[PDB]
Amino acid sequence: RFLKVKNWETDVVLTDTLHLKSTLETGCTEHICMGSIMLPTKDQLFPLAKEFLDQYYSSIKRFGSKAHMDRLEEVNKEIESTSTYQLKDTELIYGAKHAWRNASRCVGRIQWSKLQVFDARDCTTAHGMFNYICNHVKYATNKGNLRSAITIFPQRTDGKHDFRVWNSQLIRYAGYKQPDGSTLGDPANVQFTEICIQQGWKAPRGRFDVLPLLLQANGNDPELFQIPPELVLEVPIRHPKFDWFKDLGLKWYGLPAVSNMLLEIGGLEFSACPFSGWYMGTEIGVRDYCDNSRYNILEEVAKKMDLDMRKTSSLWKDQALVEINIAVLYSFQSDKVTIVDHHSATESFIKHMENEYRCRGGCPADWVWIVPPMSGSITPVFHQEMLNYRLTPSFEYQPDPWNTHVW
Amino acid sequence: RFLKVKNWETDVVLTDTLHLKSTLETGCTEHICMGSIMLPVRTKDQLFPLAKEFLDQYYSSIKRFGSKAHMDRLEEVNKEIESTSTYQLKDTELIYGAKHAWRNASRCVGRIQWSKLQVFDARDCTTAHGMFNYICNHVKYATNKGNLRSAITIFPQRTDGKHDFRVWNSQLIRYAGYKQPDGSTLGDPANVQFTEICIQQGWKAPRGRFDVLPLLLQANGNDPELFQIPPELVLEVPIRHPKFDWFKDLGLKWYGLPAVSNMLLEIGGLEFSACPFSGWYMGTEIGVRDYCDNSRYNILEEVAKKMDLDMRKTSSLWKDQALVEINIAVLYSFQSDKVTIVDHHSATESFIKHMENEYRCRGGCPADWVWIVPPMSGSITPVFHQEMLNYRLTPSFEYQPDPWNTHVWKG
Numbered sequence: 008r009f010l011k012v013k014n015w016e017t018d019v020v021l022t023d024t025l026h027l028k029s030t031l032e033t034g035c036t037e038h039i040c041m042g043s044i045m046l047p048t049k050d051q052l053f054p055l056a057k058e059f060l061d062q063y064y065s066s067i068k069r070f071g072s073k074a075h076m077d078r079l080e081e082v083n084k085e086i087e088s089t090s091t092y093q094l095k096d097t098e099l100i101y102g103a104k105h106a107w108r109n110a111s112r113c114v115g116r117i118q119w120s121k122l123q124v125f126d127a128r129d130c131t132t133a134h135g136m137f138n139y140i141c142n143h144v145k146y147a148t149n150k151g152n153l154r155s156a157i158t159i160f161p162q163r164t165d166g167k168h169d170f171r172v173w174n175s176q177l178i179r180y181a182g183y184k185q186p187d188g189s190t191l192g193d194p195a196n197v198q199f200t201e202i203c204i205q206q207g208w209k210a211p212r213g214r215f216d217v218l219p220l221l222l223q224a225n226g227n228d229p230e231l232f233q234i235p236p237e238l239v240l241e242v243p244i245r246h247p248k249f250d251w252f253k254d255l256g257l258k259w260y261g262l263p264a265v266s267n268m269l270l271e272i273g274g275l276e277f278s279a280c281p282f283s284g285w286y287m288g289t290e291i292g293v294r295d296y297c298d299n300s301r302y303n304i305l306e307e308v309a310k311k312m313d314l315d316m317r318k319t320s321s322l323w324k325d326q327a328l329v330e331i332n333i334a335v336l337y338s339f340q341s342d343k344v345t346i347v348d349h350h351s352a353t354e355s356f357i358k359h360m361e362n363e364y365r366c367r368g369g370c371p372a373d374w375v376w377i378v379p380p381m382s383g384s385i386t387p388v389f390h391q392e393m394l395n396y397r398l399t400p401s402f403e404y405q406p407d408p409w410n411t412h413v414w
Numbered sequence: 415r416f417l418k419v420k421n422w423e424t425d426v427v428l429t430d431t432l433h434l435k436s437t438l439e440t441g442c443t444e445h446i447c448m449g450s451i452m453l454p455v456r457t458k459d460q461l462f463p464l465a466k467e468f469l470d471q472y473y474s475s476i477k478r479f480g481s482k483a484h485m486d487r488l489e490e491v492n493k494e495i496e497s498t499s500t501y502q503l504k505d506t507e508l509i510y511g512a513k514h515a516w517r518n519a520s521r522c523v524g525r526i527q528w529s530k531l532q533v534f535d536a537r538d539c540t541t542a543h544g545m546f547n548y549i550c551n552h553v554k555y556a557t558n559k560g561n562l563r564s565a566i567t568i569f570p571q572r573t574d575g576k577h578d579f580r581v582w583n584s585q586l587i588r589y590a591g592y593k594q595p596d597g598s599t600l601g602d603p604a605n606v607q608f609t610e611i612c613i614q615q616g617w618k619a620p621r622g623r624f625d626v627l628p629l630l631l632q633a634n635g636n637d638p639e640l641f642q643i644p645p646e647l648v649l650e651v652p653i654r655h656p657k658f659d660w661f662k663d664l665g666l667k668w669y670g671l672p673a674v675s676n677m678l679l680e681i682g683g684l685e686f687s688a689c690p691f692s693g694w695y696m697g698t699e700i701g702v703r704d705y706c707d708n709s710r711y712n713i714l715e716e717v718a719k720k721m722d723l724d725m726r727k728t729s730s731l732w733k734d735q736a737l738v739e740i741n742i743a744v745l746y747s748f749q750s751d752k753v754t755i756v757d758h759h760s761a762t763e764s765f766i767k768h769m770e771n772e773y774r775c776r777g778g779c780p781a782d783w784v785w786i787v788p789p790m791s792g793s794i795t796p797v798f799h800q801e802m803l804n805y806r807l808t809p810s811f812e813y814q815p816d817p818w819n820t821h822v823w824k825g
């Protein structure tokens with residue numbers, strides 16, 4: 008019932024007790040592990056609220072206080088009357104920071120307590136959402152000196168008045184299927200792009216077209232907006248030794264900003280809650296650039312390096328991969344945009360994990376997602392046993408809005 | 415029940431029904447996943463159902479399920495169990511069992527080869543000397559002058575747990591590790607504890623960086639005995655690099671034959687505590703883990719220096735760069751010496767084809783993503799993008815405690 012995790016490189020053993028408070032389910036059973044699967048009422052609401060306020064009030068050294076009892080009282084009353092309840096600003100900020108703290112797939116959690124929370128619960132229109140998102144983008148970007156931020160739109164009421172950001176990230180590049188059968192731009196975004204077009208976007212059919220925002224307010228029909236180009240900081244990718252690399256015409260955006268997830272706090276559901284930090288290099292250079300179903304540029308780079316691509320055993324793919332990733336880090340650093348390499352980031356996570364075990368009794372972690380997509384075993388996380396479990400507050404996946412939207 | 419896995423690179427969806435035959439437990443629950451945890455004397459009572467389940471599998475596989483031969487064999491085993499408290503496998507059942515333990519090994523990326531396994535029956539063995547002879551023969555056969563052949567040698571099964579056969583080596587061939595008084599390590603840091611045992615047992619250590627360890631062999635629960643594998647049977651490969659001429663002067667080599675010797679083979683409820691098995695290497699096993707783990711030979715720094723990479727900041731990716739060149743060298747050296755090896759691209763690609771064939775023909779393929787994905791360049795191999803389902807099937811290979819921790823010393 009008390010669980011040990013071992014680091015096989017250092018022999019350090021930590022004991023996890025935090026998992027005992029987990030409430031949500033993993034998909035795993037006694038007979039089968041689904042660790043590698045990507046996606047595995049008034050009565051309902053009050054224990055959830057209670058669970059949350061209890062941890063909130065415990066966190067501020069005020070457990071079992073009148074103020075605690077008073078709040079529990081008040082929320083209880085409000086749920087009976089209104090069927091829901093409103094979070095105090097303090098609780099909202101706590102909840103959002105803890106949702107990030109609890110994100111078992113996030114390697115960057117050492118930063119969890121330093122999150123700028125933008126309260127957008129007063130928002131009523133897609134123009135309003137556009138304004139809040141531009142402000143988030145400008146704040147987070149901070150001229151290349153990135154700051155973590157989350158903007159929180161109104162909570163779900165009856166699921167009929169959902170606020171949604173239709174984009175999967177605030178900043179992404181469009182993708183277009185050609186007659187040539189090939190794919191222009193980012194293949195991950197073909198379907199969303201067509202939705203934009205079908206809603207009236209005038210695509211400039213390029214290879215790196217910043218997608219417009221498709222914003223849905225109050226369960227209404229989603230509207231289109233273009234982020235001011237001056238607020239979208241982008242980085243041309245060059246290599247510090249290969250002069251030809253710039254000729255590939257590659258660029259990427261500075262701000263990673265997830266916008267399709269759902270924030271759950273004290274049973275309340277925030278379906279529109281865009282959040283952003285800064286990139287780890289491999290996200291762009293390994294996944295975005297080299298994934299076969301993405302920009303998939305390994306072959307071109309390999310050719311320009313004049314590698315023997317006859318046999319897999321020359322490791323030409325691996326060689327190109329390292330260089331591409333060298334160029335990404337080099338390009339961001341050179342333009343003074345915050346980025347972190349996978350060595351630094353995983354090293355930071357090990358120390359965070361130790362802090363969490365030391366000060367919280369554990370740290371939920373998904374090894375499959377925490378270990379970087381290159382050079383896995385030369386990073387300390389590869390050798391670190393991890394326990395994965397779900398705590399709340401949390402960020403959750405939710406269905407793409409277009410499959411669910413009664414137009 | 416049906417379970418689907420998706421490949422996020424191809425959108426190929428597979429459906430698993432085999433997991434319904436899973437008997438043993440994972441360590442995971444509805445509330446926690448222990449997928450990254452490395453490690454999470456039977457009564458007649460429990461033994462016959464295990465025998466029966468195994469024999470039903472075996473007879474189905476040969477399309478004789480429910481036959482008189484099937485029925486007679488169940489009867490024969492039942493009687494042998496109730497009179498002798500255990501039973502003996504037929505040679506056919508032993509071979510089937512050992513192949514299926516490999517087929518079922520969810521952490522093994524090389525399973526496309528599972529049906530090609532040479533099984534050496536060493537169940538008539540009685541002494542450590544006899545074990546030494548069997549193991550020498552296995553090494554020679556498996557090595558095959560560099561044209562490696564998979565093999566397994568199976569020693570007598572457990573009886574009362576007081577007469578176990580054990581190979582104390584974790585692998586048949588490994589290099590000594592020596593802890594120095596200054597705290598530095600000579601040789602392979604992984605093998606320091608076992609090296610010290612060997613020394614205590616009377617081994618005269620040459621004390622170099624690549625000393626092949628003696629075999630420490632335990633027959634019938636007796637105290638283990640030391641033997642040196644004849645050097646002529648130990649095939650090694652000097653490591654050099656195709657473009658970098660200074661790489662040879664690093665003084666590296668490795669052995670050709672990976673042969674795991676510390677696991678337990680379970681077949682039909684019977685326990686084979688000594689069952690060394692061998693295949694051939696995937697390059698990263700040596701070039702990534704053996705050479706570049708901080709807790710192993712740990713050569714990234716020296717290599718990176720000699721390449722004159724910028725080592726002042728991790729962001730130069732000097733470690734990643736040196737790591738690739740080392741792995742190129744390992745592959746180059748083995749290929750140049752005509753010793754069987756497979757790169758992580760070939761091996762994972764073959765595994766995906768194997769896995770898909772298994773889903774279609776068997777209803778599933780249990781697989782441990784954490785172990786299947788190679789320790790470098792993960793997402794540029796197809797297994798990274800493949801969802802997998804991990805579950806336990808028997809026959810199986812299991813971990814067992816290290817014998818020095820449990821052995822009752824005779825003296």
Ligand code: HEM
Nearest residue numbers: 107110112113114115118155157282283284285286287402
């Ligand atoms: C500040 C620097 C940050 C770094 C370096 C970082 C790093 C990462 C990385 C590498 C991933 C894996 C993503 C992928 O492979 O697709 C990830 C996932 C994730 N991050 Fe962080 N992150 C940061 C900030 C944040 C913040 C501020 C939040 C929330 C407030 C957050 C929440 C999450 C969540 C929920 C996931 C999982 C998404 C999913 O399940 O697909 N991260 N992070």
Ligand code: HEM
Nearest residue numbers: 516519521522523524527564566691692693694695696811
């Ligand atoms: C023929 C070529 C083979 C290749 C290329 C191969 C490859 C691998 C690799 C790379 C691993 C991961 C080991 C590690 O990272 O420490 C592994 C594990 C394993 N292999 Fe294979 N293998 C082969 C043959 C075999 C054979 C013949 C057997 C048994 C008859 C076998 C059974 C296993 C088992 C039980 C494990 C898990 C060991 C553990 O959990 O520590 N393999 N294999």
Ligand SMILES: COCCN(C)c1cncc(CCc2cc(C)cc(N)n2)c1
Nearest residue numbers: 175176263265267282283284285286287
């Ligand atoms: C976009 O929502 C789904 C989450 N997934 C799968 C996803 C797909 N591509 C990129 C990201 C971005 C992950 C991410 C998020 C943040 C906040 C920082 C950072 N460095 N990285 C997430």
Ligand SMILES: COCCN(C)c1cncc(CCc2cc(C)cc(N)n2)c1
Nearest residue numbers: 584585672674676691692693694695696
């Ligand atoms: C040695 O006991 C197993 C423990 N582990 C994880 C372990 C440690 N070092 C090397 C191996 C070798 C695994 C292995 C086995 C076989 C048969 C072929 C191959 N290519 N690789 C396994």
Ligand SMILES: C[C@H](O)[C@H](O)[C@H]1CNc2nc(N)[nH]c(=O)c2N1
Nearest residue numbers: 389390391392450451452784785
């Ligand atoms: C903690 C973690 O489970 C451990 O480091 C595992 C990870 N994956 C692995 N994968 C392989 N093939 N071999 C290993 O030794 C390990 N080690």
Ligand SMILES: C[C@H](O)[C@H](O)[C@H]1CNc2nc(N)[nH]c(=O)c2N1
Nearest residue numbers: 043044045375376798799800801
């Ligand atoms: C099938 C597998 O779960 C899938 O490829 C996962 C593996 N690990 C990952 N890890 C991260 N960080 N991001 C990902 O998108 C994935 N994809």
Ligand SMILES: [Zn+2]
Nearest residue numbers: 035040442447
């Ligand atoms: Zn699991």
